[PDB]
Amino acid sequence: VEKLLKNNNLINILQNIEQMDTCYVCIRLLQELAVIPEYRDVIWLHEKKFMPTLFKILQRATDSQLATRIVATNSNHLGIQLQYHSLLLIWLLTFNPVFANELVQKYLSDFLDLLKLVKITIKEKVSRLCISIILQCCSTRVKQHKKVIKQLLLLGNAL
Amino acid sequence: KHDIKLYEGDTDKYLDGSGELYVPPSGSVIDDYVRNASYLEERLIQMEDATDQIEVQKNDLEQYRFILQSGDEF
């Protein structure tokens, strides 16, 4: 799992999102492995490569109106899964107390966007997970939770 | 506040000119709309009370400006 992560070819396929097929499979392979506690630690090492792309799918959904139907990612089954997978991969790493503190400090801009997802969707899959990922980082267990809470409430209009 | 009389005219439809325009072809996120109105409203009611308060003080003082001047001379 660590080795497969370091490589060029599997991450290149994952990086592309303008072919639904490529991204869909890749995020799922990563995420499925993340269920088992041990991988979470190695998967986080290679984070900085996949993670902006995972954020890009989520942002991309917020900007394109649900009032229409496109076949790429809307309110139809394909889109619903893409968003879900990305958020699920995230949620899993964030369960570890240190990782979650580290997530907020690096990914801050991208992180605030979760609030937005909850609002535009009706999908109970997309929304539960956005709120949950925030809840984990706001937790008592997490180091420097007082700081993260200020940052969220103030900038992101969380309250 | 605006000195505007009640508008009803009772439209949800998008077919009409006014229908298309005062009612979006976009969806309805009930939270978003509530928020849009709440914040402006908080400023406005605070504003009106101020306007009234300021106006009464200015008016009293303007009236009695001249009064005290006349009285200084008598």
PDB file of N, CA and C in Angstrom, chain A residues 18-115:
ATOM      1  N   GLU A  18     -11.612  14.463 -15.049  1.00  0.00           N
ATOM      2  CA  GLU A  18     -12.326  14.825 -16.238  1.00  0.00           C
ATOM      3  C   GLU A  18     -12.608  13.583 -17.021  1.00  0.00           C
ATOM      4  N   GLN A  19     -12.295  12.411 -16.464  1.00  0.00           N
ATOM      5  CA  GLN A  19     -12.802  11.115 -16.839  1.00  0.00           C
ATOM      6  C   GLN A  19     -13.214  10.545 -15.521  1.00  0.00           C
ATOM      7  N   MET A  20     -14.547  10.330 -15.380  1.00  0.00           N
ATOM      8  CA  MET A  20     -15.353   9.963 -14.211  1.00  0.00           C
ATOM      9  C   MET A  20     -14.736   8.642 -13.740  1.00  0.00           C
ATOM     10  N   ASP A  21     -14.461   7.707 -14.746  1.00  0.00           N
ATOM     11  CA  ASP A  21     -14.116   6.273 -14.598  1.00  0.00           C
ATOM     12  C   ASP A  21     -12.882   6.198 -13.834  1.00  0.00           C
ATOM     13  N   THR A  22     -11.872   7.052 -14.228  1.00  0.00           N
ATOM     14  CA  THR A  22     -10.570   6.939 -13.574  1.00  0.00           C
ATOM     15  C   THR A  22     -10.547   7.205 -12.134  1.00  0.00           C
ATOM     16  N   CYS A  23     -11.155   8.376 -11.743  1.00  0.00           N
ATOM     17  CA  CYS A  23     -11.227   8.884 -10.383  1.00  0.00           C
ATOM     18  C   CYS A  23     -11.985   8.017  -9.469  1.00  0.00           C
ATOM     19  N   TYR A  24     -13.120   7.510 -10.002  1.00  0.00           N
ATOM     20  CA  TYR A  24     -14.126   6.791  -9.249  1.00  0.00           C
ATOM     21  C   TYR A  24     -13.421   5.532  -8.635  1.00  0.00           C
ATOM     22  N   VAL A  25     -12.707   4.718  -9.491  1.00  0.00           N
ATOM     23  CA  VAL A  25     -12.054   3.515  -9.127  1.00  0.00           C
ATOM     24  C   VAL A  25     -10.976   3.777  -8.104  1.00  0.00           C
ATOM     25  N   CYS A  26     -10.078   4.770  -8.326  1.00  0.00           N
ATOM     26  CA  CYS A  26      -8.903   5.127  -7.618  1.00  0.00           C
ATOM     27  C   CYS A  26      -9.149   5.561  -6.231  1.00  0.00           C
ATOM     28  N   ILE A  27     -10.181   6.356  -6.043  1.00  0.00           N
ATOM     29  CA  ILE A  27     -10.559   6.906  -4.699  1.00  0.00           C
ATOM     30  C   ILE A  27     -11.101   5.741  -3.841  1.00  0.00           C
ATOM     31  N   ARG A  28     -11.901   4.905  -4.402  1.00  0.00           N
ATOM     32  CA  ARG A  28     -12.374   3.674  -3.852  1.00  0.00           C
ATOM     33  C   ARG A  28     -11.328   2.637  -3.433  1.00  0.00           C
ATOM     34  N   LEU A  29     -10.247   2.456  -4.246  1.00  0.00           N
ATOM     35  CA  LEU A  29      -9.194   1.487  -3.926  1.00  0.00           C
ATOM     36  C   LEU A  29      -8.589   1.982  -2.568  1.00  0.00           C
ATOM     37  N   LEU A  30      -8.208   3.295  -2.469  1.00  0.00           N
ATOM     38  CA  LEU A  30      -7.504   4.005  -1.400  1.00  0.00           C
ATOM     39  C   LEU A  30      -8.306   3.915  -0.174  1.00  0.00           C
ATOM     40  N   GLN A  31      -9.576   4.221  -0.300  1.00  0.00           N
ATOM     41  CA  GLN A  31     -10.540   4.400   0.779  1.00  0.00           C
ATOM     42  C   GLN A  31     -10.883   3.089   1.474  1.00  0.00           C
ATOM     43  N   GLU A  32     -10.998   1.971   0.677  1.00  0.00           N
ATOM     44  CA  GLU A  32     -11.342   0.630   1.071  1.00  0.00           C
ATOM     45  C   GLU A  32     -10.328   0.038   1.975  1.00  0.00           C
ATOM     46  N   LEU A  33      -9.077   0.340   1.608  1.00  0.00           N
ATOM     47  CA  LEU A  33      -7.911   0.019   2.370  1.00  0.00           C
ATOM     48  C   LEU A  33      -7.923   0.818   3.620  1.00  0.00           C
ATOM     49  N   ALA A  34      -8.368   2.092   3.629  1.00  0.00           N
ATOM     50  CA  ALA A  34      -8.341   3.032   4.827  1.00  0.00           C
ATOM     51  C   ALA A  34      -9.203   2.527   5.965  1.00  0.00           C
ATOM     52  N   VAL A  35     -10.259   1.705   5.678  1.00  0.00           N
ATOM     53  CA  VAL A  35     -11.130   1.097   6.691  1.00  0.00           C
ATOM     54  C   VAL A  35     -10.417   0.372   7.758  1.00  0.00           C
ATOM     55  N   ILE A  36      -9.295  -0.266   7.393  1.00  0.00           N
ATOM     56  CA  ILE A  36      -8.487  -1.035   8.277  1.00  0.00           C
ATOM     57  C   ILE A  36      -7.525  -0.083   8.887  1.00  0.00           C
ATOM     58  N   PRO A  37      -7.456  -0.031  10.238  1.00  0.00           N
ATOM     59  CA  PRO A  37      -6.791   1.048  10.950  1.00  0.00           C
ATOM     60  C   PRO A  37      -5.305   1.334  10.522  1.00  0.00           C
ATOM     61  N   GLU A  38      -4.427   0.332  10.261  1.00  0.00           N
ATOM     62  CA  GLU A  38      -2.978   0.331   9.992  1.00  0.00           C
ATOM     63  C   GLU A  38      -2.553   1.186   8.743  1.00  0.00           C
ATOM     64  N   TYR A  39      -3.377   1.099   7.662  1.00  0.00           N
ATOM     65  CA  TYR A  39      -3.117   1.838   6.437  1.00  0.00           C
ATOM     66  C   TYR A  39      -3.202   3.288   6.534  1.00  0.00           C
ATOM     67  N   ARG A  40      -4.070   3.827   7.528  1.00  0.00           N
ATOM     68  CA  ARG A  40      -4.465   5.185   7.711  1.00  0.00           C
ATOM     69  C   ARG A  40      -3.230   6.065   7.831  1.00  0.00           C
ATOM     70  N   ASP A  41      -2.266   5.491   8.607  1.00  0.00           N
ATOM     71  CA  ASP A  41      -0.939   6.039   8.953  1.00  0.00           C
ATOM     72  C   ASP A  41      -0.083   6.121   7.705  1.00  0.00           C
ATOM     73  N   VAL A  42      -0.032   5.006   6.805  1.00  0.00           N
ATOM     74  CA  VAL A  42       0.792   5.119   5.602  1.00  0.00           C
ATOM     75  C   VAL A  42       0.111   5.979   4.549  1.00  0.00           C
ATOM     76  N   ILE A  43      -1.214   5.925   4.367  1.00  0.00           N
ATOM     77  CA  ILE A  43      -1.990   6.622   3.397  1.00  0.00           C
ATOM     78  C   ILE A  43      -1.780   8.139   3.597  1.00  0.00           C
ATOM     79  N   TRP A  44      -1.737   8.645   4.908  1.00  0.00           N
ATOM     80  CA  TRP A  44      -1.554  10.014   5.306  1.00  0.00           C
ATOM     81  C   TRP A  44      -0.172  10.617   4.808  1.00  0.00           C
ATOM     82  N   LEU A  45       0.901   9.774   4.713  1.00  0.00           N
ATOM     83  CA  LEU A  45       2.188  10.135   4.176  1.00  0.00           C
ATOM     84  C   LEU A  45       2.240  10.630   2.730  1.00  0.00           C
ATOM     85  N   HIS A  46       1.407   9.974   1.911  1.00  0.00           N
ATOM     86  CA  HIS A  46       1.233  10.331   0.552  1.00  0.00           C
ATOM     87  C   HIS A  46       0.110  11.279   0.302  1.00  0.00           C
ATOM     88  N   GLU A  47      -0.577  11.831   1.363  1.00  0.00           N
ATOM     89  CA  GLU A  47      -1.782  12.685   1.380  1.00  0.00           C
ATOM     90  C   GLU A  47      -1.714  13.776   0.435  1.00  0.00           C
ATOM     91  N   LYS A  48      -0.596  14.535   0.538  1.00  0.00           N
ATOM     92  CA  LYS A  48      -0.396  15.815  -0.159  1.00  0.00           C
ATOM     93  C   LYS A  48      -0.500  15.777  -1.602  1.00  0.00           C
ATOM     94  N   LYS A  49      -0.337  14.582  -2.224  1.00  0.00           N
ATOM     95  CA  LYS A  49      -0.664  14.312  -3.605  1.00  0.00           C
ATOM     96  C   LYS A  49      -2.093  14.126  -4.064  1.00  0.00           C
ATOM     97  N   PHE A  50      -2.873  13.209  -3.422  1.00  0.00           N
ATOM     98  CA  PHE A  50      -4.262  12.931  -3.741  1.00  0.00           C
ATOM     99  C   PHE A  50      -5.224  14.010  -3.219  1.00  0.00           C
ATOM    100  N   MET A  51      -4.981  14.577  -2.015  1.00  0.00           N
ATOM    101  CA  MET A  51      -5.901  15.398  -1.209  1.00  0.00           C
ATOM    102  C   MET A  51      -6.283  16.635  -1.904  1.00  0.00           C
ATOM    103  N   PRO A  52      -5.589  17.425  -2.631  1.00  0.00           N
ATOM    104  CA  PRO A  52      -6.155  18.591  -3.260  1.00  0.00           C
ATOM    105  C   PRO A  52      -7.216  18.235  -4.316  1.00  0.00           C
ATOM    106  N   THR A  53      -7.007  17.159  -5.017  1.00  0.00           N
ATOM    107  CA  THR A  53      -7.840  16.590  -6.077  1.00  0.00           C
ATOM    108  C   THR A  53      -9.178  16.166  -5.491  1.00  0.00           C
ATOM    109  N   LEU A  54      -9.158  15.464  -4.280  1.00  0.00           N
ATOM    110  CA  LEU A  54     -10.351  15.046  -3.545  1.00  0.00           C
ATOM    111  C   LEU A  54     -11.125  16.286  -3.217  1.00  0.00           C
ATOM    112  N   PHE A  55     -10.411  17.425  -2.881  1.00  0.00           N
ATOM    113  CA  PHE A  55     -11.104  18.635  -2.514  1.00  0.00           C
ATOM    114  C   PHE A  55     -11.740  19.270  -3.755  1.00  0.00           C
ATOM    115  N   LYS A  56     -11.070  19.158  -4.904  1.00  0.00           N
ATOM    116  CA  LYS A  56     -11.470  19.714  -6.200  1.00  0.00           C
ATOM    117  C   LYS A  56     -12.760  19.091  -6.646  1.00  0.00           C
ATOM    118  N   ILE A  57     -13.015  17.774  -6.448  1.00  0.00           N
ATOM    119  CA  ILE A  57     -14.281  17.191  -6.843  1.00  0.00           C
ATOM    120  C   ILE A  57     -15.402  17.752  -6.064  1.00  0.00           C
ATOM    121  N   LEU A  58     -15.176  18.042  -4.722  1.00  0.00           N
ATOM    122  CA  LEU A  58     -16.177  18.471  -3.803  1.00  0.00           C
ATOM    123  C   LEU A  58     -16.681  19.919  -4.027  1.00  0.00           C
ATOM    124  N   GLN A  59     -15.678  20.800  -4.310  1.00  0.00           N
ATOM    125  CA  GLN A  59     -15.816  22.199  -4.711  1.00  0.00           C
ATOM    126  C   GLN A  59     -16.518  22.282  -6.003  1.00  0.00           C
ATOM    127  N   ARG A  60     -16.119  21.385  -6.950  1.00  0.00           N
ATOM    128  CA  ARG A  60     -16.705  21.353  -8.309  1.00  0.00           C
ATOM    129  C   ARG A  60     -18.232  21.110  -8.307  1.00  0.00           C
ATOM    130  N   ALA A  61     -18.709  20.241  -7.396  1.00  0.00           N
ATOM    131  CA  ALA A  61     -20.069  19.979  -7.116  1.00  0.00           C
ATOM    132  C   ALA A  61     -20.816  21.191  -6.559  1.00  0.00           C
ATOM    133  N   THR A  62     -20.204  21.985  -5.671  1.00  0.00           N
ATOM    134  CA  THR A  62     -20.828  23.118  -5.051  1.00  0.00           C
ATOM    135  C   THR A  62     -21.164  24.128  -6.106  1.00  0.00           C
ATOM    136  N   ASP A  63     -20.208  24.395  -7.077  1.00  0.00           N
ATOM    137  CA  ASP A  63     -20.396  25.433  -8.129  1.00  0.00           C
ATOM    138  C   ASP A  63     -21.335  25.129  -9.203  1.00  0.00           C
ATOM    139  N   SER A  64     -21.556  23.876  -9.548  1.00  0.00           N
ATOM    140  CA  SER A  64     -22.471  23.550 -10.631  1.00  0.00           C
ATOM    141  C   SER A  64     -23.852  23.229 -10.119  1.00  0.00           C
ATOM    142  N   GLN A  65     -24.822  24.004 -10.644  1.00  0.00           N
ATOM    143  CA  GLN A  65     -26.149  23.991 -10.089  1.00  0.00           C
ATOM    144  C   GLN A  65     -26.842  22.616 -10.202  1.00  0.00           C
ATOM    145  N   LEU A  66     -27.557  22.181  -9.127  1.00  0.00           N
ATOM    146  CA  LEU A  66     -28.342  20.909  -9.008  1.00  0.00           C
ATOM    147  C   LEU A  66     -29.632  21.047  -9.714  1.00  0.00           C
ATOM    148  N   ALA A  67     -29.996  22.281 -10.114  1.00  0.00           N
ATOM    149  CA  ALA A  67     -31.245  22.668 -10.793  1.00  0.00           C
ATOM    150  C   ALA A  67     -31.325  22.228 -12.184  1.00  0.00           C
ATOM    151  N   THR A  68     -30.145  21.814 -12.676  1.00  0.00           N
ATOM    152  CA  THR A  68     -29.939  21.277 -13.983  1.00  0.00           C
ATOM    153  C   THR A  68     -29.712  19.861 -13.703  1.00  0.00           C
ATOM    154  N   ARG A  69     -29.313  19.083 -14.768  1.00  0.00           N
ATOM    155  CA  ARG A  69     -28.805  17.746 -14.805  1.00  0.00           C
ATOM    156  C   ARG A  69     -27.768  17.868 -15.861  1.00  0.00           C
ATOM    157  N   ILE A  70     -26.562  17.430 -15.353  1.00  0.00           N
ATOM    158  CA  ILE A  70     -25.460  17.075 -16.248  1.00  0.00           C
ATOM    159  C   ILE A  70     -25.279  15.675 -15.855  1.00  0.00           C
ATOM    160  N   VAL A  71     -24.467  14.942 -16.636  1.00  0.00           N
ATOM    161  CA  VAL A  71     -24.309  13.555 -16.437  1.00  0.00           C
ATOM    162  C   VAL A  71     -23.002  13.321 -15.775  1.00  0.00           C
ATOM    163  N   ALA A  72     -22.183  14.343 -15.558  1.00  0.00           N
ATOM    164  CA  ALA A  72     -20.884  14.274 -14.999  1.00  0.00           C
ATOM    165  C   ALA A  72     -20.940  14.171 -13.465  1.00  0.00           C
ATOM    166  N   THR A  73     -21.723  15.079 -12.744  1.00  0.00           N
ATOM    167  CA  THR A  73     -21.832  14.991 -11.285  1.00  0.00           C
ATOM    168  C   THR A  73     -22.949  16.004 -11.049  1.00  0.00           C
ATOM    169  N   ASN A  74     -24.099  15.567 -10.652  1.00  0.00           N
ATOM    170  CA  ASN A  74     -25.208  16.405 -10.308  1.00  0.00           C
ATOM    171  C   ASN A  74     -25.822  15.655  -9.112  1.00  0.00           C
ATOM    172  N   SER A  75     -27.174  15.395  -9.139  1.00  0.00           N
ATOM    173  CA  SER A  75     -27.956  14.833  -8.171  1.00  0.00           C
ATOM    174  C   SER A  75     -28.184  13.437  -8.614  1.00  0.00           C
ATOM    175  N   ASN A  76     -27.441  12.909  -9.642  1.00  0.00           N
ATOM    176  CA  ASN A  76     -27.685  11.545 -10.181  1.00  0.00           C
ATOM    177  C   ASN A  76     -26.707  10.739  -9.506  1.00  0.00           C
ATOM    178  N   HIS A  77     -26.934   9.380  -9.572  1.00  0.00           N
ATOM    179  CA  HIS A  77     -26.241   8.378  -8.808  1.00  0.00           C
ATOM    180  C   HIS A  77     -24.686   8.442  -8.923  1.00  0.00           C
ATOM    181  N   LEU A  78     -24.153   8.725 -10.134  1.00  0.00           N
ATOM    182  CA  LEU A  78     -22.688   8.786 -10.371  1.00  0.00           C
ATOM    183  C   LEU A  78     -21.986   9.850  -9.553  1.00  0.00           C
ATOM    184  N   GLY A  79     -22.532  11.060  -9.544  1.00  0.00           N
ATOM    185  CA  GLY A  79     -22.064  12.193  -8.753  1.00  0.00           C
ATOM    186  C   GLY A  79     -22.106  12.109  -7.301  1.00  0.00           C
ATOM    187  N   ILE A  80     -23.183  11.439  -6.877  1.00  0.00           N
ATOM    188  CA  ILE A  80     -23.517  11.256  -5.485  1.00  0.00           C
ATOM    189  C   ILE A  80     -22.466  10.375  -4.856  1.00  0.00           C
ATOM    190  N   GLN A  81     -21.990   9.327  -5.639  1.00  0.00           N
ATOM    191  CA  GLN A  81     -20.995   8.425  -5.186  1.00  0.00           C
ATOM    192  C   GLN A  81     -19.584   9.091  -5.138  1.00  0.00           C
ATOM    193  N   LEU A  82     -19.319   9.983  -6.174  1.00  0.00           N
ATOM    194  CA  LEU A  82     -17.986  10.587  -6.292  1.00  0.00           C
ATOM    195  C   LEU A  82     -17.744  11.445  -5.004  1.00  0.00           C
ATOM    196  N   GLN A  83     -18.772  12.228  -4.623  1.00  0.00           N
ATOM    197  CA  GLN A  83     -18.646  13.161  -3.518  1.00  0.00           C
ATOM    198  C   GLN A  83     -18.357  12.420  -2.220  1.00  0.00           C
ATOM    199  N   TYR A  84     -19.107  11.301  -2.076  1.00  0.00           N
ATOM    200  CA  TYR A  84     -19.285  10.413  -0.936  1.00  0.00           C
ATOM    201  C   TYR A  84     -17.942   9.734  -0.621  1.00  0.00           C
ATOM    202  N   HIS A  85     -17.307   9.314  -1.740  1.00  0.00           N
ATOM    203  CA  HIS A  85     -16.086   8.526  -1.688  1.00  0.00           C
ATOM    204  C   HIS A  85     -14.966   9.363  -1.158  1.00  0.00           C
ATOM    205  N   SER A  86     -14.884  10.682  -1.716  1.00  0.00           N
ATOM    206  CA  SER A  86     -13.955  11.647  -1.336  1.00  0.00           C
ATOM    207  C   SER A  86     -14.021  12.021   0.110  1.00  0.00           C
ATOM    208  N   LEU A  87     -15.231  12.208   0.627  1.00  0.00           N
ATOM    209  CA  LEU A  87     -15.494  12.589   1.990  1.00  0.00           C
ATOM    210  C   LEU A  87     -15.186  11.432   2.969  1.00  0.00           C
ATOM    211  N   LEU A  88     -15.500  10.230   2.572  1.00  0.00           N
ATOM    212  CA  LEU A  88     -15.304   8.984   3.303  1.00  0.00           C
ATOM    213  C   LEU A  88     -13.786   8.748   3.454  1.00  0.00           C
ATOM    214  N   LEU A  89     -12.963   8.976   2.442  1.00  0.00           N
ATOM    215  CA  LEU A  89     -11.513   8.785   2.466  1.00  0.00           C
ATOM    216  C   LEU A  89     -10.936   9.716   3.519  1.00  0.00           C
ATOM    217  N   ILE A  90     -11.483  10.972   3.538  1.00  0.00           N
ATOM    218  CA  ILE A  90     -11.110  12.044   4.431  1.00  0.00           C
ATOM    219  C   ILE A  90     -11.387  11.642   5.852  1.00  0.00           C
ATOM    220  N   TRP A  91     -12.655  11.206   6.097  1.00  0.00           N
ATOM    221  CA  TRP A  91     -13.218  10.977   7.442  1.00  0.00           C
ATOM    222  C   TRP A  91     -12.466  10.004   8.218  1.00  0.00           C
ATOM    223  N   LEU A  92     -11.986   8.971   7.444  1.00  0.00           N
ATOM    224  CA  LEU A  92     -11.207   7.879   7.926  1.00  0.00           C
ATOM    225  C   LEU A  92      -9.863   8.223   8.494  1.00  0.00           C
ATOM    226  N   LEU A  93      -9.055   9.049   7.810  1.00  0.00           N
ATOM    227  CA  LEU A  93      -7.767   9.510   8.297  1.00  0.00           C
ATOM    228  C   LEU A  93      -7.885  10.318   9.560  1.00  0.00           C
ATOM    229  N   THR A  94      -8.973  11.201   9.587  1.00  0.00           N
ATOM    230  CA  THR A  94      -9.315  12.240  10.600  1.00  0.00           C
ATOM    231  C   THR A  94      -9.684  11.611  11.887  1.00  0.00           C
ATOM    232  N   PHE A  95     -10.072  10.304  11.937  1.00  0.00           N
ATOM    233  CA  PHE A  95     -10.410   9.584  13.169  1.00  0.00           C
ATOM    234  C   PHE A  95      -9.324   9.535  14.183  1.00  0.00           C
ATOM    235  N   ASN A  96      -8.013   9.435  13.711  1.00  0.00           N
ATOM    236  CA  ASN A  96      -6.799   9.547  14.582  1.00  0.00           C
ATOM    237  C   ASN A  96      -6.674  10.941  15.144  1.00  0.00           C
ATOM    238  N   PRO A  97      -6.509  11.185  16.463  1.00  0.00           N
ATOM    239  CA  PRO A  97      -6.469  12.511  17.092  1.00  0.00           C
ATOM    240  C   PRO A  97      -5.433  13.471  16.609  1.00  0.00           C
ATOM    241  N   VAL A  98      -4.202  13.123  16.320  1.00  0.00           N
ATOM    242  CA  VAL A  98      -3.200  14.035  15.812  1.00  0.00           C
ATOM    243  C   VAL A  98      -3.480  14.522  14.423  1.00  0.00           C
ATOM    244  N   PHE A  99      -3.882  13.588  13.502  1.00  0.00           N
ATOM    245  CA  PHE A  99      -4.081  13.781  12.091  1.00  0.00           C
ATOM    246  C   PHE A  99      -5.053  14.825  11.821  1.00  0.00           C
ATOM    247  N   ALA A 100      -6.109  14.900  12.625  1.00  0.00           N
ATOM    248  CA  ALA A 100      -7.228  15.785  12.528  1.00  0.00           C
ATOM    249  C   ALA A 100      -6.796  17.169  12.803  1.00  0.00           C
ATOM    250  N   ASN A 101      -5.917  17.427  13.850  1.00  0.00           N
ATOM    251  CA  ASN A 101      -5.386  18.754  14.191  1.00  0.00           C
ATOM    252  C   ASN A 101      -4.582  19.292  12.984  1.00  0.00           C
ATOM    253  N   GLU A 102      -3.669  18.407  12.442  1.00  0.00           N
ATOM    254  CA  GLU A 102      -2.795  18.594  11.307  1.00  0.00           C
ATOM    255  C   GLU A 102      -3.645  18.930  10.054  1.00  0.00           C
ATOM    256  N   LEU A 103      -4.853  18.300   9.781  1.00  0.00           N
ATOM    257  CA  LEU A 103      -5.696  18.481   8.654  1.00  0.00           C
ATOM    258  C   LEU A 103      -6.164  19.857   8.562  1.00  0.00           C
ATOM    259  N   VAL A 104      -6.677  20.422   9.685  1.00  0.00           N
ATOM    260  CA  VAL A 104      -7.260  21.818   9.812  1.00  0.00           C
ATOM    261  C   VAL A 104      -6.229  22.803   9.490  1.00  0.00           C
ATOM    262  N   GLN A 105      -4.975  22.689   9.974  1.00  0.00           N
ATOM    263  CA  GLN A 105      -3.872  23.687   9.851  1.00  0.00           C
ATOM    264  C   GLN A 105      -3.315  23.756   8.453  1.00  0.00           C
ATOM    265  N   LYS A 106      -3.262  22.597   7.748  1.00  0.00           N
ATOM    266  CA  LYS A 106      -2.827  22.556   6.350  1.00  0.00           C
ATOM    267  C   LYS A 106      -3.912  22.945   5.431  1.00  0.00           C
ATOM    268  N   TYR A 107      -5.075  22.298   5.558  1.00  0.00           N
ATOM    269  CA  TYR A 107      -6.073  22.334   4.458  1.00  0.00           C
ATOM    270  C   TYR A 107      -7.079  23.305   4.643  1.00  0.00           C
ATOM    271  N   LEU A 108      -6.978  24.314   5.467  1.00  0.00           N
ATOM    272  CA  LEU A 108      -7.943  25.226   6.000  1.00  0.00           C
ATOM    273  C   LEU A 108      -8.842  25.777   5.018  1.00  0.00           C
ATOM    274  N   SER A 109      -8.385  26.395   3.903  1.00  0.00           N
ATOM    275  CA  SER A 109      -9.286  26.917   2.931  1.00  0.00           C
ATOM    276  C   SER A 109     -10.343  25.946   2.348  1.00  0.00           C
ATOM    277  N   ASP A 110      -9.864  24.798   1.890  1.00  0.00           N
ATOM    278  CA  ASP A 110     -10.517  23.651   1.324  1.00  0.00           C
ATOM    279  C   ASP A 110     -11.551  22.956   2.331  1.00  0.00           C
ATOM    280  N   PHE A 111     -11.204  22.866   3.563  1.00  0.00           N
ATOM    281  CA  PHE A 111     -11.904  22.355   4.701  1.00  0.00           C
ATOM    282  C   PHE A 111     -13.171  23.143   4.938  1.00  0.00           C
ATOM    283  N   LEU A 112     -13.121  24.531   4.806  1.00  0.00           N
ATOM    284  CA  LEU A 112     -14.251  25.361   5.134  1.00  0.00           C
ATOM    285  C   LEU A 112     -15.437  25.157   4.218  1.00  0.00           C
ATOM    286  N   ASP A 113     -15.153  24.642   2.996  1.00  0.00           N
ATOM    287  CA  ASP A 113     -16.024  24.390   1.879  1.00  0.00           C
ATOM    288  C   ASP A 113     -17.058  23.302   2.235  1.00  0.00           C
ATOM    289  N   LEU A 114     -16.741  22.430   3.276  1.00  0.00           N
ATOM    290  CA  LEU A 114     -17.645  21.331   3.658  1.00  0.00           C
ATOM    291  C   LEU A 114     -19.041  21.847   3.998  1.00  0.00           C
ATOM    292  N   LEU A 115     -19.182  22.980   4.648  1.00  0.00           N
ATOM    293  CA  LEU A 115     -20.390  23.675   5.189  1.00  0.00           C
ATOM    294  C   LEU A 115     -21.348  23.933   4.023  1.00  0.00           C
TER     295      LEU A 115
END
